[PDB]
Design a binder for this molecule. Sequence first.
Ligand SMILES: Nc1cccc2c(=O)[nH]c(-c3ccc(Cl)cc3)cc12
Ligand SMILES: [Zn+2]
Length: 209
Amino acid sequence: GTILIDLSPDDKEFQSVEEEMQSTVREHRDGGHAGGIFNRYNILKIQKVCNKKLWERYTHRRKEVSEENHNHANERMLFHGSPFVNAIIHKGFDERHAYIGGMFGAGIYFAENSSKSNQYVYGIGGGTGCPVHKDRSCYICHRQLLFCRVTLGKSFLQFSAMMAHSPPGHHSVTGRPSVNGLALAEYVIYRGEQAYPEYLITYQIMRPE
Ligand SMILES: Nc1cccc2c(=O)[nH]c(-c3ccc(Cl)cc3)cc12
Ligand SMILES: [Zn+2]
């Protein structure tokens, strides 16, 4: 069902996605261990992910959520990094894509910081790095992130020092940073239907000069 349509770099939609990718890079407390050392990315391709079935799966759930939340889906655009990216874009998000050991329980995790999702591209803690060089900080191998439309609904605020169910009466969990000054928020949904994998970004991390 899925088709991938390339966006021209001249297209304002390309530029706005690249800008969110680039401007949400931060330094991480692991000093680059999981995701590599970089301040910016070389964006190689942005593709729009088009799947009618999956989109309708998403908009149905979004409607259910907003109807439970005074007509407010609380929709965000958030990054997602995973070794299952290629599965996700064909079959949609489901329980196989959950971070089982996550600080907010077994759910599917999204980030405001692109560099945060970048840590999971090769797996939990960056795994053993790129399959070709076994290097978590590879500057050569091509990486992929998703920029996703996500329905938060009523989100449970977890103040935090940084498949299951949502907490009763909520539709998601918000991981609010309570120590790392510059960290952006992280979010968890417990229904895969509450996200749609809208953009596939192919990129490299870049070596600082
Ligand atoms: N803990 C996280 C916080 C923010 C963003 C992400 C994210 O983008 N991906 C992930 C992730 C994805 C797949 C698997 Cl198998 C494990 C973790 C976590 C994650
Ligand atoms: Zn490599």
